[model samples]
Target: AAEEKTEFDVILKAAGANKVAVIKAVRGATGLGLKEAKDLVESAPAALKEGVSKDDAEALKKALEEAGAEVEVK
Candidate 1:
């Protein structure tokens, strides 16, 4: 059987968030291209990287936050 992931949701929330940073972080994490990454970030509260462990998620959350996004771990 496939190993199920101990996933965490990396979410962005707000009215005036740093969208560019979000896209950048999303691309950095998922290796997605600009267009796809932009789409994901624009959809706020979306998971930038799912199926990640707590440690990984926290690390990524910092990366994304440092990228200029107000990110959340859920």
Candidate 2:
């Protein structure tokens, strides 16, 4: 019975040359403050969002990717 809804997790893999850009992207993706977003990016390999719908998860991942950050969705 495949009655379960599929959820996804968005993870920040790495920040590219423009860490600031990535930080801003994470901020919008996670709705975190500037400092908090910076912390998350600095930490690296952190989960931005979890248990999100497939579309939203993919959107967020795409946003991060466009900002030059490595993102993984699963």
Candidate 3:
């Protein structure tokens, strides 16, 4: 079955990673503050953002992965 995905969600895996790294990545992407970043990182499997275009979702997925979050785009 071929499904053309138009919207996606960037999720954090629960295994765990450096909060500092997560914080930086989240902050950079969302333009949030220290508290928000910290909160986001602490809450694993949270959505970085939802309902994004293919290109933007893929791009964000790649960057977030490098930033140390185990990201999944769906």
Clashing pairs in 3: none
Question: Which ten contiguous residues of candidate 1 have the minimum total lDDT?
Answer: 14-23
- What are the Cα lDDT values of the candidates? 0.68, 0.80, 0.71
What is the TM-score (0 to 1) of candidate 2? 0.80
CA-RMSD of model 3: 2.6
Q: Which model is ahead, 1 or 2, in terms of lDDT? A: 2
Q: Write one digit per residue (lDDT tens) for candidate 3, span 1-74.
A: 99877877777664246566667667777887788767766777677888877787778667666765577766
Model 2 agreement with the true structure over 1-74: per-residue lDDT tens digits: 76777878888888877787777777777678888888888898888888999989878777767776788876
lDDT of 3: 0.71
Off by over 4 Å in 3: 1-4, 14-16
TM per prediction: 0.68, 0.80, 0.74
Instruction: Highest lDDT: give the candidate number.
Output: 2
Candidate 1 local lDDT, 30-57, one digit each (tens):
8887887776666665766666788878
lDDT: worst 10-residue window of model 2: 60-69
